[PDB]
Amino acid sequence: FTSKFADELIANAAYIGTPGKGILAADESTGTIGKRLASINVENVESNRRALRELLFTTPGALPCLSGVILFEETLYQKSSDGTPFVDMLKSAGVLPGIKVDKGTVELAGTNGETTTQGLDGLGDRCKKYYEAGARFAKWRAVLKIGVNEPSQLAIHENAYGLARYAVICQENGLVPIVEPEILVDGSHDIQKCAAVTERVLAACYKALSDHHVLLEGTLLKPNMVTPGSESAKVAPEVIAEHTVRALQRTVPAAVPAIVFLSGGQSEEEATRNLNAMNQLKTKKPWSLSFSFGRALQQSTLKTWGGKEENVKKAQEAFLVRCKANSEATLGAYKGD
Amino acid sequence: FTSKFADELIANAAYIGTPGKGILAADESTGTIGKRLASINVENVESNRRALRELLFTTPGALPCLSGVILFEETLYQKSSDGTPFVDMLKSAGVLPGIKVDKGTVELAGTNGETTTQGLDGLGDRCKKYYEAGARFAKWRAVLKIGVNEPSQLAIHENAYGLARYAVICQENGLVPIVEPEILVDGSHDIQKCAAVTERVLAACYKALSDHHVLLEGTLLKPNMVTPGSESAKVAPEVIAEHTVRALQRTVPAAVPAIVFLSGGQSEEEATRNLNAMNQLKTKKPWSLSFSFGRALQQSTLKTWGGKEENVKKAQEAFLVRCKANSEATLGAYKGD
Amino acid sequence: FTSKFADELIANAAYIGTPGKGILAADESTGTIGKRLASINVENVESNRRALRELLFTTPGALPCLSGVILFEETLYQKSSDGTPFVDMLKSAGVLPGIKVDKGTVELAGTNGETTTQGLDGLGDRCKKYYEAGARFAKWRAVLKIGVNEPSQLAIHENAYGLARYAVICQENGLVPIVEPEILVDGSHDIQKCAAVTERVLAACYKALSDHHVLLEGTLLKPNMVTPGSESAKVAPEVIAEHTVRALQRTVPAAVPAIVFLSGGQSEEEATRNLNAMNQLKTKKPWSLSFSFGRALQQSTLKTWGGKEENVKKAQEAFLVRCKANSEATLGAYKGD
Amino acid sequence: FTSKFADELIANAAYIGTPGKGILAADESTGTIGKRLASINVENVESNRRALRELLFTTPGALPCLSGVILFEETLYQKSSDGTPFVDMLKSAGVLPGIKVDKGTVELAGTNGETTTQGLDGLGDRCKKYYEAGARFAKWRAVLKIGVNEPSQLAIHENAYGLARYAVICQENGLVPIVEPEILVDGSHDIQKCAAVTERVLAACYKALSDHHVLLEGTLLKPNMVTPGSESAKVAPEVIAEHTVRALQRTVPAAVPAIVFLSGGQSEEEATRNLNAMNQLKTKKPWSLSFSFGRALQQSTLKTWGGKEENVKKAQEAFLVRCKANSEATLGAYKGD
Incomplete structure (x- = not known):
């Protein structure tokens, strides 16, 4: 398998990992963004979703910190207040538009609330329409949990091979697949457990991608950082870094151009x-280490904004703060704000 | 010497050397651009200079290939057709605006047509106005020639210490100085001679910059590539590369973030x-090797454009071709047109 | 799985990949060395085997080019003419002694002459005795062939999981395992085929090593270079290099310190x-690229030597030539003889 | 200036900077070693100096940690207890023998106790004899002090140009020159002052080496680390590292293969x-950062070794500890002992 998009996939995937840049994940479904809007007393109507995405995308200074922005299908075809398609707004600034293509998760019978991710049906034709609309990368999220017997061989197998198949289809249709095998932080496991599970899961995913003949140079990885569980004592950034990078060195081929962490x-x-x-x-790191953040990029902007329009300039200043900080983080040059 | 701009100088100089980006030198004077406009039957009026610079700067796809654009003073204050100041147009795309600050060359008495570069008088106050107008780097060109007795000790000394003093003033006023000691190609000398002269000149320039307590991490170098003289047989890119990188390894401190070659x-x-x-x-290259090109970036665009407006879309496609090609060249990934 | 030898394994594996050094494979069995000795009219008695290994190991200048020497069990316990144990001779020069621990190959029923490698029975106890005798690394050779239906899923699976199990046992007993999945060059396949098969095989091997909880940082890889088949037209070193390094980038974790190619x-x-x-x-190479050569290091020495002792000085100069050349090759500094 | 030794100079200088290796400075004069021997109640006779250097050089395990050993003229021609010339002992183990060639310091009139280094007279003929005796690198120590008016322009100039001229003569006779501009710690100055003085001194030295047409690729630098003065509070290794590496980035060309710090x-x-x-x-470090240690390698060995020969095995285990630790330090892998 060589795609006709092979050169463009390799160029775009490498571009996403440009030092100083990372990805804004603005791909929250109509429901998920509902929750976010609720959490700051705003109704979930298309009026407000458009307003919020426009706030982000027209923040002075923000787009230059961004190699990519993950959109939801609605937003991919939406225009701003002045009739500018968001995808043009992105492109003008050198930002690749991305598209969430998974159709969410379902529970696996005979497991303890483990899931598999749906979305392969008609995915080829979707990806082609998305490419024609200006998308150049894709997202698919697989979710694994840590427990006594989790993640199970079945969960791993299903999620790895679901990611691999998604990756091929993406590449056939000119979209760089972001491979996202998220290991949920939930629990009181230690960082060592997280490390072992992350190592096992990534090794399963790269084996699957090899079996599916994926062009690794035309892909991205969006893994969790290796951290203690959500109920365990927090640990210094240097400890997170040591464990995370060690896990990646053990599992992620040099051929992969960039690793864009989820928060x-x-x-x-x-x-x-x-x-x-x-x-x-x-230490040996043969990939760019960057960001693909949603909540970690938007949380304080959502709050400053609240509801209406006096707090746009203030919320845009807040958004710039986080974009600039994460950009500096990709260069190892973040000193604190 | 610590500047109050020291952090911003270091960040901006590092930014210019971002993999995939380089500098467009669009800083040709009112006369020099006249020549270029003439050479394709266009009158040298402010109307057309603005039109040409706008053509370049509003090329879809081009700005993302550019970390910086060197401007002439006129262009620094000019706006586009839609009222956008060029410096804002550039910034929105993450491009740093730069300013040519030298006042040209004069011949040195007692030499064989060797020159020194003028421009130190009132340079501080100029740089400060330029900073306030949105400029964040500067350019000063020293010119050296190769002959039986050239470049002379006097020419070297004058040009190195002129560059050094320019560099300090720049940094005091928040402009990253591009240090440009151009060794002209004119003559029948071979590449080995060019290499020896380039090594001598760069060693003189970094000595001067040390004596002037310049913050090297807040500077840039725009040297000639090491090539055979104008009358000698041209040589393969691999030979240019070997001699050039060897010269830089021998002379340019690792503290310098990027080397932006002149064409x-x-x-x-x-x-x-x-x-x-x-x-x-x-080979060990502790700096970004990038581009600061004028004619090498504009030549084919100038011609396609000719005069008027049906050839804008075509000329912008031509400009994108060269921007994209040089961007790929900074990554070592240029395969040919 | 944490070994008590973990630190020493990681230090020794990293040591083998020291730039300027590689491995001499002198581990040919009593029969295989018979063939080599025959091929230059020498009887296969312990007299001569000792003489030949002593010739190699007492070559002025040779040992400094060697981070390791793979021995056969006989040689591991042998002394030189003057009562110096070879393992002390090696250590004095900073050379790690290594031990061949596989017991050769057998054919797999239902395949076309594909093999699996034997040697797991009592391997732990062997490795422990070998460690006590001064061995610090081990060798196990798996063999795969290229054909219409080769290598088969069964061959791959058997060889990958045989390597993985061998690797853990090695590490439990303080021997850095050289993982050697040799894809035989035999046939008229092109380099693209070799690339695809090498990529599939290495991906299977690292999946197995992960399943077996092997410490990658305490291992080595001895793969084939990616080449056209033995019956296909030879190609330039730069083509071999491009395909080979691409295959390794796609499959071998950064955690592995060094790749010691078989000839x-x-x-x-x-x-x-x-x-x-x-x-x-x-290109991104997160491992040392070195040598583990047998015949490619000894062939011309074997011939110069012939049988007799007038040709020792001459044969030792020949051996030094190849040691020196390969040492230079590890640094990318070999210019030809 | 092209040496006939140019290839060997470049290969040997690069060799000294092999990761995992550094230099033992055992070059202390008849007087200086007197002091060391006194400090542990041993008479300064050639008997004991030989015994001490033999202790070091015949330490099981030590030589593999060493790319070079700097000798004093006496030791260069000495043999061990068993008739083994030291230079052969070194070579057998892959260690380059080096030779101290300066003839000590003298005071500069019109300065405050600043010195210049002697030794240029007949240095060519000495270097040639030393090369013939098996030496392949050289050492010359310049001494600078830090004071209100120190180091002076005169002291810097004299020491830089003395080093440059020494370097040329070395290279003409096939010895890689270690350039050693030692800035003494004496005083109450902070690390920032040491940094500024080290940066000024090194910049003067590389300017001089350029003027003298020295082949940088065939040289080594032995500078002080950047530290607080002797009367100021000691500072954490991370602070030493930051200031030291920054000073070297600012001054030492990439062409220099290795920086072997004095203790x-x-x-x-x-x-x-x-x-x-x-x-x-x-951070960008285009040279090996290794060691050329005297006291920091020998101090604890000197003490364990009382004078008599029952304490040799114990003192050799102590010497191995420091060799092993510094070897690990060159790799960034030292964890403490």
């Missing part, structure tokens, strides 16, 4: 600090 | 190919 | 030139 | 820790 419920500042520490570690 | 006499394609070969050399 | 029927000079080209390639 | 006033453990921290700094 997974870490605070805005903590996510930045952890990423920074990874870029300050003197 | 000099070189064609569009030749400049790209030579830069690419440098980025394919596996 | 696999290449000539002395060709092996050196191919290794050199790999170290001249500007 | 100066530092303890064994402190020297190792500081070196290690430099190799753990994530």
Whole structure:
């Protein structure tokens, strides 16, 4: 398998990992963004979703910190207040538009609330329409949990091979697949457990991608950082960095151009600090270590904004703060704000 | 000497050397651009200079290939057709605006047509106005020639210490100085001679910068590539690369973040190919090897454009071709057109 | 799985990959060395085997080019003419002694002459005795072939999991396992085929090693270079290098410290030139690229020596030539004889 | 200036900077070693100096940690107890023998106790004899002090140009020159002052080496680490590392293959820790950062070795500890002992 998009996939995937840049995940479904809007007393109508995404995308200074922005299908075709398609707004600034293509998760019978991710049906034709609409990368999220018997062989197998198949289809249709095998932080396991599970899961995913003949140079990885569980004592950025980078060195081929971490419920500042520490570690890292943050990029902007329009300039200043901080983190040059 | 701009100088100088980006030198005076406009039957009025710079700067896809654009003073204050100041147009795309600050050359008594560069008088106050107008780097060109007795000790000394003093003033006023000691190609000397002269000159320049207590991590170097003289047989990109990188390894401190080659006499394609070969050399290179090209970036765009407006879309496609090619060259990934 | 030897394994595996050094494979059994001795009219008695190994190991200048020497069990316990144990001779020069621990190959029923490698029975106790005798690394050779239906899923699976189990036992007993999945060069397949098969095989091997909880940082890889088949047209070193390094980038974790190529029927000079080209390639290589050569290091020495003792000084100068050339090749600094 | 030794100079200088290796400075004159021997109640006769250097050089395990050993003229021609010439002992183990060639310092009139280094007279003929005796590198120590008006322009100029001229003569006779501009720690100045003085001194030295047409690729630098003065509070290894590496980045061309730090006033453990921290700094370092230690390698060995021969095995185990620790420090892998 050589795609006709092979050169463009390799160029775009490498571009996403440009030092100083990372990805804004703005791909929250109509429901998920509902929750976010609720959490700051705003109705979930298309009026407000458009307003919020426009706030982000027209923040002075923000787009230059961004190699990519993950959109939801609605937003991919939406225009701003002045009739500018968001995808053009992105492109003008050198930002690749991305598209969430998974159709969410379902529970696996005979497991303890483990899931598999849906979305392969008609995915080829979707990806082609998305490419035609200006998308150049894709997202698919697989979710694994840590427990006594988790993640199970079945959960791993299903999620790895679901990611691999998604990756091929993406590449056939000119979209760089972000491979996202998220290991949830939930629990009182220690960082060593997280490390072992992350190592096992990534090794399963790269084996699957090899079996599916995926062009690794035309892909991205969006893994969790290796951290203690959500109920365990927090640990310094340097400890997160050591464990995380060691896990990646053990599993992720050099052919992969960039690793764009998910924040997974870490605070805005903590996510930045952890990423920074990874870029300050003197060790073999044959991939860019960057960000693909949603909540960790938007949380404080959502709050400053609240509802209406006096707080746009203030919320845009807040958004710039986090974009700039994460950009600095990719270069290992974040000093704190 | 610690500048209050020290952090911003270091961040901006590092930014210019971002993999995938380089500098467009669009800083040709009112007269020099006249020549270029003449050469394609366009009158040299402010109407057309603005139109040409706008053509370049509003090329879809081009700005993302550019970490910086060197402007002439006129262009620094000019706006586009839609009222956007060029410096804002550039910033929105993450491009640093730069300013040519030298006042040209004068001949040195007692030499064989060797020059020194003028421009120190009132330079501080100029740089400060330029900073306030949105400029964040500066350019000063010293010119050296190769002859039986050239470059002379006097020419070298004058040009190195003129550059050093310019560099300090720049940094005091928040402009990253591009240090440009251009060794002209004119003559029948071979590449070995060029190498020895380039090594001598750069060693003189870094000595001067040390004596002037310049913050090297807040500077840039725009040297000639090491090539045979104008009357000698041209040589393969691999040979240009070997001699050039060896010269830089011998002279340019690792503290300097990036080396942005001038194109000099070189064609569009030749400049790209030579830069690419440098980025394919596996050797210790503690600086970004990038581009600061004028004619090598504009030549084919100037021609396609000709005069008027049906040839804008076509000329912008031509400009994108060269921007994209040089961007690929900074990554060592240029495969040819 | 944490070994008590973990720190020493990681230090020794990293040591083998020291730039300027590689491995001499002198581990040919009593029969195989018989063939080699025959091929230059010498009887296969313990007298001569000792004489030949002593010739190699007492070559002025040779041992400094060697981070390791793979021995056969006989040689591990043998002394030189003057009562110096070879293992002390090696250690004095900073050379790690290694031990061949596989018991050869057997054919797999239902395949077309594909093999699996034997030797797991009592391997733990062997490795412990070998460690006590001064061995610090081990060798196990798996063999895969290329054909219409080869290598088969069964061959791959058997060889990968045989290597993995061998690797853990090694590490439990303080021997750095060289993981050697040799894909035989035999056939008229092209280099693209070799690339695809090498990529599939290595991916299967690292999956197995992960399943077996092997410490990658305490291992080595001895793969075939990626080459056209033995019956296909030879190609330039730079082509071998491009395909080989690409295959390794796609499959071998950064955690592995070093890759010591087998020569696999290449000539002395060709092996050196191919290794050199790999170290001249500007590309992400998170491991040392070195040599583990047998015939490619000894062939010309065997011949110069012949049988008799007038040709020792001459044969030792020949051996030094190849040691020195391969040492230079590890640094990318080999220019030809 | 092209030496006939140019290839061998470049290969040997690069060899000295092999990761995992550094230099033992055992070159203390008849007087200086007197002091060391006195300090542990041993008479300064050639009997005992030989015994001490033999102790070091015949330590099981030590030589593999060493790319070079700097000798005093006496030791260069000495043999061990068993008739083995030291230079053969070194070579057998892959260690380059080096020779101290300066003839000590003299005071500069019109300065405040500043010195210049002697030794240029007949140095060519000495270097040639030394090369013939098996030496392949050389050492010359310049001494600078830090005061209100020190180091003076005159002291710097004299020492830089003395080093440059020494370097040329070395290279003409096939010895890699170690350039050693030692800035003494004496005083109450802070680390920032040491940094500024080290940067000024090194910049003067590389300017001089350029003027003298020295082949940088065939040289070594032995500078002080950047530290607080002798009367100021000691500072953490990370702070030493940051200031030291920054000073070198600012001044030492990439063409120089290795920087072999002098230990100066530092303890064994402190020297190792500081070196290690430099190799753990994530920053552009286009040279090997290694060691050329005297006191920091020998101090604890001198003490364990009382004078008599029952304490040799114990003192050799102590010497191995420091060799092993510094070797690990060159790799950034020292964890403490």
